Amino acid sequence: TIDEGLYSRQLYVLGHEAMKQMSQSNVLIIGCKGLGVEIAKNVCLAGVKSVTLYDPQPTRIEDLSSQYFLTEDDIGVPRAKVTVSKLAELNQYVPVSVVDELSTEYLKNFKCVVVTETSLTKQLEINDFTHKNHIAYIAADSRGLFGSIFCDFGENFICTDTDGNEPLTGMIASITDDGVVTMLEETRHGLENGDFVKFTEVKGMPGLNDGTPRKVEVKGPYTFSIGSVKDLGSAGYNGVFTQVKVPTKISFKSLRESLKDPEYVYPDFGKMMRPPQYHIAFQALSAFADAHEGSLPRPRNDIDAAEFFEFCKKIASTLQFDVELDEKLIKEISYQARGDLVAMSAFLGGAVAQEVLKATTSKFYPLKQYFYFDSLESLPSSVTISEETCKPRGCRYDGQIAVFGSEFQEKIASLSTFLVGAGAIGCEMLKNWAMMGVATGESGHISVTDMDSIEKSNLNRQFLFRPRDVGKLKSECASTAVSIMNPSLTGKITSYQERVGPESEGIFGDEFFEKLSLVTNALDNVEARMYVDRRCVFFEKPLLESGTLGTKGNTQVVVPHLTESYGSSQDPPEKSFPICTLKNFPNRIEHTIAWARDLFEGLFKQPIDNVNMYLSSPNFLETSLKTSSNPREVLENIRDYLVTEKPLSFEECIMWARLQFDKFFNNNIQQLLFNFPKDSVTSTGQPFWSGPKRAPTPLSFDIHNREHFDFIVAAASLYAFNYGLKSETDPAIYERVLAGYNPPPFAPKSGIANKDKQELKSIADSLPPPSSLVGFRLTPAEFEKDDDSNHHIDFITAASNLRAMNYDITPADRFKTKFVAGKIVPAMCTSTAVVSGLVCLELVKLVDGKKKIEEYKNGFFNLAIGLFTFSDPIASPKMKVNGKEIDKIWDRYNLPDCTLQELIDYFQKEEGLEVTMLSSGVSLLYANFQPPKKLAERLPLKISELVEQITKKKLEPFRKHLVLEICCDDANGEDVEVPFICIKL
Amino acid sequence: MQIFVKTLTGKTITLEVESSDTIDNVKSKIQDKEGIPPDQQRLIFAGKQLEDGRTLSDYNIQKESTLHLVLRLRGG
Amino acid sequence: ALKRINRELADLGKDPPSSSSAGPVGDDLFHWQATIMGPADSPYAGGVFFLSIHFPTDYPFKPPKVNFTTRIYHPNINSNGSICLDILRDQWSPALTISKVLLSISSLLTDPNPDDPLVPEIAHVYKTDRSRYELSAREWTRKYAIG
Ligand SMILES: Nc1ncnc2c1ncn2[C@@H]1O[C@H](COP(=O)(O)OP(=O)(O)OP(=O)(O)O)[C@@H](O)[C@H]1O
Ligand SMILES: [Mg+2]
Ligand SMILES: [Mg+2]
């Protein structure tokens, strides 16, 4: 009973069984500061049964540094009491409660217990109980730029899925007598040693199709081994294999046992000696707090640092830790003890919420057991950081000033950022900026642009939007929400509904970009990313890129004159199937879904567009007769949809749907089998319908069958929508109309001058004149996946399953059909939180203006396996031009609006280079091989005039520059690459 | 020398290389074992992204070293 | 994309393709019109076939869209001009030039592949009645590819 209208994107990550188990699990969260509220928000969005909060501590001003559900009117009220009301709105299916006191025996009501802001003695007391009663325990801590997570799911935790990948399947070519399985031509199985597989449709070895998993021994990218199959047969031909994923048993240790001998998860292999240091440091923090009435070391205090280091020495000696303590790092942990950063809170809260989901679902591999993280490279170095600058000022930014200082706060308050996109990452980024205090100064400003509107499925991971906001613009709602979070942002945010691209350069022009400090992308496609990257390269602005997919994510930083841009690297492209496979020889459900989408377009979109264009353009027929690749098809479509097969009622729509069923599932298959009989052989004597080619069989229409009736209903409804008729859903009318249907006879055809043009003319003049039909239009069908009442996904599912039945392919349901046809990207709130945290940790590096390239980190992670990795950005390549060092990316030529001849002469005299090609946009302004007359015509013209003449379009008034690409050769004739030219108009 | 490559999806790959091999040879081996073109491979060792034209000894990659094969994602 | 396209164009200009001639339409670098000459030892001998090439914005990281404009009676070319060529759908790499694609198309014209066809009826005629296929191909190349 999962509401798929809300959990659409999350179900593609977790699944129905996982969410069913989640909806029966109780989560207790101790602590309601930034980390705790982040965890609780992510858990409420995920969809657990309920959440209970325990935090009786009264609110303080500094708590607002990362707690975005607290306002300055809540000072002196317990944090849980003021947080529960705002948490109860995130998800209506998840109640949120508060308990004023905790007893140990009360812990048995919860599936998972999360602990934050709790001393080590209390943690030991809680874990001693949860461990022996088999309750999942998670403890998280966030101290300045340092973080720690600990997980303990019990001694006998059962994990059913350990990586979150789909089971591997493949088509076999042959299985020898010794179990050597070979894949089809140039096909990789992708298995690893120790995997289990099961076989089906294996011919010659009927014993392998029972369904018993077998061990896999990988012998190469194309073959593997399963053992001895001597008894089952001598050799097997064809068939398919599917991977079997087996449960695993993970055994955890209690906190008391694991303090002495911890097991570390390493977020970075560049610093593998640190986690042992942090293990001692956090325990020393707990001891220090216990010795000072629960007070942490004061910011940048040397006396407290010395005492803390003494505690660290004592703890290290007690635990027999044979590790040499790094004094600088440990004292850094001491200095930032009272730090409370929203970026660290977001990062750790996303990770911890994913761990909670793992505990409640028994899916994905959990952290085992200690995860110590630092982002110490984010500490500013361009400002003074001392005890005087880091002391609290009694403001909401105290938790951040305790780390960065007041001067860096002044630097942050005067940022002028530009955020492209307002989705999940955009909402998280806006929240982080509001908490950090970005753009709250006199010279600060925020600009956010997004052309989309809020939908029901977006509420699952875009926590700034509520159900009342459905149908409104994303950017306006996000700006209002963050102005509520931080009132100082009132009037400092401007929201646009513009798409960023070539068509919006009049709004995001030179004046707009010249005032920015940095650009942050929150997009979901590569085209927009490339466009924004090119704009940032031209204007020399820092760019923050981030992306997510399910549980995976990455973040990249582009720094002018230091690193390469976003477009300097290539990603794997989308997979498109061969046209021959889709047209005639499918063997996967994906092929049939692509075919069904093309059928939908060809039945309800293209003919309607042709009919509408015929009734509008006065010279449509003549242009189409020599422009399109098949004017006969256009004429036939117009005739059929205007006169020949225009329905007058819904019964004619039903009859049309029946005829289309016959056309696409019975007659084309008969024609194909007439061309290639099932007994036919190739040119080499092999059978034709073998391997990837499956012999089809025609379908006979049966009204009682569910798929046939579904196809008829959906097709009739869509046809009626095209003609604006009143559709019906009662099966009685369908069964009555289809009963009296006489199929026209069909016989496959064996085949065996200039009058065709005359026939086309006769067809054209037979059409009614456009003047006779004025104000008459046919409504085309525009594909929409998120609506479950337009019959689009219903039609595609029915057509795909019918074609699968033709070729004996296993049909899919509406869920998978919508996933494949809609190109849906799986999305999670936890991954969004993690990427926003990483991006905001890089943002402070950008604000500080760090110059070295080793101080920046690009991040990659997969939360399903608990993998984190970081790497320095790649430096921009250099080159030698005229014996000078030139940056291949960030350098350009600045020239006035001179003539073409003057530009060529300048490049000859100054750079000693001969210009061979000059282009702008998508036009060739100049080439060395053009005829002399054309050149002599184009030489004495200015660059702006030349561009206007060649492109046949005048430059817009807001256009202030031109970008030219130039290819030139040296004196010896060697081609030398040069940077682009920026002509100033 | 034998090294291990871990993918962002959890797969593990074992490569037989030598300290004098260039990054191009390693990328070609990874392409042979996985089909990923060398221009689309992002290899990370000890917080450094490996670049073409250099050798393994430039990164101090010794035996039983672990590299990470990563990629960028388009959602969000 | 512009620099790569111009480099390919200049390379074509330097060494003539002999049996082919591709160039931009007007001044647009992302729209070419190529010409292919029918092989002598083929039914399409003495024929001129026009192809339209559309370079995507992501060239060379996405394949060019190549479509026949002249009608041709081939088992692997349908009535819309679509060409059943692997290097144009999923085997494309950013290391193949337009000259290589033209050579591949000429090789396809010199000998069809009816075992994995795009037009099953022409493939059936080719496999069963070869002489009728030859006559039909000659008739089509005389009717459309000449003039
Ligand atoms: N060129 C663009 N200019 C501005 N905003 C853009 C552009 N392309 C995409 N966006 C916005 O970027 C955001 C992408 O985030 P996200 O993918 O999570 O949202 P969505 O596309 O609405 O949701 P879903 O893909 O899950 O159905 C969306 O708001 C989308 O409107
Ligand atoms: Mg949307
Ligand atoms: Mg999207």
Q: Which residues of C57-82 are buried (b: 16+ CB within 10 A; e: fewer)?
A: ebbbbbbbebebebbbbbbbbbeebb
Concatenated DSSP letters of A461-504: T-TT--GGGTTSBHHHHHHHHHHHH-GGGTTSEEEE-PPPSGGG
Q: Does A269 touch chain B (CB under 8 A)?
A: yes
Same domain, A909 and A925: yes
As a whole number of angstroms, the distance between CA A461 and CA A41 comes to 10
Same domain, A653 and A666: yes
* Ligand lying nearest the CA atom of residue A422: 1
Tokens matching residue A440? 């709250």
Which of A809, A824, A839 terminates a domain? The answer is A824
Report the residue from C13, C80, C114 with minimal CB separation from A630. C80
Chain A with chain C: Cβ pairs closer than 8 A: 79
Q: Which residues of B44-56 are buried (b: 16+ CB within 10 A; e: fewer)?
A: bbbebbbeeeebb
As a whole number of angstroms, the distance between CA A280 and CA A326 comes to 11
Concatenated DSSP letters of A310-328: HHHHHHHHHTT------HH
Q: With contacts defined as CB-CB under 8 Å, which chain C residues touch A583?
A: 118
Strand C48-54 and strand B2-7: pairing?
Answer: unpaired
Tokens matching residue A511? 């004046």
Q: Does A409 touch chain B (CB under 8 A)?
A: no
Q: Which residues 83-102 of C are in CB contact (within 8 Å) with A? A: 84, 86, 89-90, 94
Domain count, chain A: 6
User: Distance, in angstroms, between B19 CA and closest chain A CA?
Assistant: 20
Which of A347, A376, A410 terminates a domain? The answer is A410
Inter-CA distances, A194 with A167, A222, A225, A243, A279, Å:
14, 16, 11, 11, 35
As a whole number of angstroms, the distance between CA C56 and CA C88 comes to 12
Length of chain A: 985
Q: How far is the CA of A195 from the centre of ligand 3 (A)?
A: 35
**Sign of the alpha-carbon torsion through A284, A289, A292, A298:** positive
Same domain, A556 and A580: no
Same domain, A148 and A177: no
Q: Specify the residue for token string 């790959």.
A: B13
Residue pair B69/B30 in contact by the 8 Å Cβ criterion? yes
Residue pair C22/C12 in contact by the 8 Å Cβ criterion? yes
Q: Which atom of ligand 1 is nearest to the CA of A474?
A: 29
Q: Residue with the nearest Cα to atom 28 of ligand 1?
A: A423
Domain count, chain C: 1
Q: CB A576 to CB C84 under 8 A?
A: no
**Mutate which of A457, A503, A505, A523 to test ligand 1's pocket (most atoms within 8 Å of Cβ)?**
A523
Q: How far is the CA of A521 from the centre of ligand 3 (A)?
A: 13
Residues 6+ apart with CB under 8 A from A745: none
Q: Specify the residue for token string 């929400």.
A: A481
As a whole number of angstroms, the distance between CA A764 and CA A743 comes to 29
Q: CB A569 to CB B72 under 8 A?
A: yes
Strand B66-70 and strand B42-45: pairing?
Answer: antiparallel
Same domain, A743 and A661: yes
Which CATH class for the B1-71 domain?
A: alpha beta
Q: Does C4 touch chain A (CB under 8 A)?
A: no
Phi (first) and psi of residue A967, to 5 degrees: -115, 125
Q: CB C116 to CB A922 under 8 A?
A: no
Q: Which atom of ligand 1 is nearest to the CA of A522?
A: 12
| A580 belongs to the catalytic site | yes
User: Distance, in angstroms, between A760 CA and closest chain B CA?
Assistant: 48
Cβ of A239 closer than 6 Å to ligand 1, yes or no, is no
Phi (first) and psi of residue A771, to 5 degrees: -65, -35
Q: What is the largest CA-CA distance in chain C?
A: 49
Helices A829-848 and A34-46, interaxial angle, to 10°? 140
CATH of the domain at C66: 3.10.110.10
As a whole number of angstroms, the distance between CA A910 and CA A534 comes to 27
Q: With contacts defined as CB-CB under 8 Å, which chain B residues touch A836?
A: none
Q: CB A965 to CB C3 under 8 A?
A: yes
A9 marked among binding-site residues: yes
Strand A543-549 and strand A552-558: pairing?
Answer: antiparallel
Q: With contacts defined as CB-CB under 8 Å, which chain A residues touch C28?
A: 922-924
Catalytic hit among A44, A580, A967, A968: A580
Inter-CA distances, B72 with A154, A528, A545, A583, Å:
35, 15, 10, 33
Strand A981-984 and strand A552-558: pairing?
Answer: unpaired
Cβ of A547 closer than 6 Å to ligand 1, yes or no, is no
Q: With contacts defined as CB-CB under 8 Å, which chain B residues touch A268?
A: 47
Cβ of A460 closer than 6 Å to ligand 1, yes or no, is no
CATH of the domain at A345: 3.40.50.12550
Strand A180-183 and strand C20-25: pairing?
Answer: unpaired
Cβ of A690 closer than 6 Å to ligand 1, yes or no, is no
A755 marked among binding-site residues: no
Q: How far is the CA of A805 from the centre of ligand 1 (A)?
A: 36
Q: Residue with the nearest Cα to atom 16 of ligand 1?
A: A423
Catalytic hit among C37, C53, C84, C137: C84
As a whole number of angstroms, the distance between CA A127 and CA A113 comes to 9
Same domain, A656 and A713: yes
Same domain, A432 and A497: yes
**Could you count the other beta carbons within 10 Å of the beta carbon of residue A30?**
22
Which residues are placed with Cβ below 5 angstroms of ligand 2, an ion? A 452
Phi (first) and psi of residue A969, to 5 degrees: -115, 150
What is the experimental resolution, given in Å to one decimal place?
Answer: 2.5
Chain breaks in chain B (C to N over 2.5 A) after: none
3-state secondary structure A31-93: CCCHHHHHHHHHHHHHCCCEEEEECCCECCHHHHHCCCCCCHHHCCCEHHHHHHHHHCCCCCC
As a whole number of angstroms, the distance between CA A725 and CA A21 comes to 45
Residue A688 amino acid letter: F
Same domain, A648 and A689: yes
Q: Which atom of ligand 1 is nearest to the CA of A499?
A: 3
Instruction: Report the residue of chain B nearest A546, measured CA to CA.
Output: B76
Inter-CA distances, A480 with A21, A92, A112, A477, A519, Å:
36, 22, 35, 5, 21
Q: With contacts defined as CB-CB under 8 Å, which chain B residues touch A192?
A: 11-12
Q: Residue with the nearest Cα to atom 8 of ligand 1?
A: A523
Same domain, A110 and A130: no
Tokens matching residue A188? 């990789």
Q: Which atom of ligand 1 is nearest to the CA of A8?
A: 26
Q: Does A869 touch chain B (CB under 8 A)?
A: yes
Q: Specify the residue for token string 């994990």.
A: A159
* Ligand lying nearest the CA atom of residue A528: 1
CA angle at residue A872 from A869 to A873, to 5 degrees? 115
Tokens matching residue A640? 């059929």
Per-domain residue ranges for chain B?
A: 1-71
Chain breaks in chain A (C to N over 2.5 A) after: 752
Q: Does A248 touch chain B (CB under 8 A)?
A: no
Inter-CA distances, A133 with A123, A153, A252, A256, C25, Å:
15, 11, 13, 15, 76
Task: Provide the domain limits for residue C100.
Answer: 2-143
Same domain, A716 and A850: no
On the question of a cis peptide bond just before residue A369, with omega within 30 degrees of 0, the verdict is yes
* Ligand lying nearest the CA atom of residue A822: 1
CATH of the domain at A777: 1.10.10.2660
Residue pair A238/A201 in contact by the 8 Å Cβ criterion? yes
Residue A105 amino acid letter: E
User: Distance, in angstroms, between A86 CA and closest chain C CA?
Assistant: 46
Q: What is the CA radius of gyration of chain B?
A: 12
Which of A377, A395, A410 terminates a domain? The answer is A410
Which of A354, A304, A364, A356 has the alpha carbon at shortest distance from A334? A304
Q: Which atom of ligand 1 is nearest to the CA of A786?
A: 27
Task: Provide the domain limits for residue A913.
Answer: 892-985
Given phi > 0 = left and psi -120 to 50 = alpha, else beta, which region is A519? beta
Same domain, A206 and A333: no
* Ligand lying nearest the CA atom of residue A825: 1
Q: What is the CA radius of gyration of chain C?
A: 16
As a whole number of angstroms, the distance between CA A889 and CA B13 comes to 35
**Mutate which of A425, A452, A496 to test ligand 1's pocket (most atoms within 8 Å of Cβ)?**
A452
Concatenated DSSP letters of A733-753: HHHHHHHT--PPP--------
At C131, is the secondary structure helix, strand, or coil?
Answer: helix
Q: CB A165 to CB B76 under 8 A?
A: no
Same domain, A431 and A371: no
Q: With contacts defined as CB-CB under 8 Å, which chain B residues touch A858?
A: 49
Residues 6+ apart with CB under 8 A from A757: none
Cβ of A523 closer than 6 Å to ligand 1, yes or no, is yes
Chain centre distance of CA A158: 29
Chain centre distance of CA C115: 20
Q: CB B42 to CB A862 under 8 A?
A: no
As a whole number of angstroms, the distance between CA A946 and CA B14 comes to 58
Q: Does B53 touch chain A (CB under 8 A)?
A: no
Inter-CA distances, C123 with A693, A752, A939, C68, Å:
16, 14, 55, 19
A524 marked among binding-site residues: yes
Report the residue from C27, C61, C121 with minimal CB separation from A570. C61
User: Distance, in angstroms, between C80 CA and closest chain A CA?
Assistant: 6
CA angle at residue A49 from A45 to A55, to 5 degrees? 75
Instruction: Report the residue of chain A nearest C122, measured CA to CA.
Output: A675
A424, HSE (Cβ side, Cα atoms, 13 Å): 29
Q: CB C27 to CB A929 under 8 A?
A: no
Q: How far is the CA of A525 from the centre of ligand 1 (A)?
A: 8
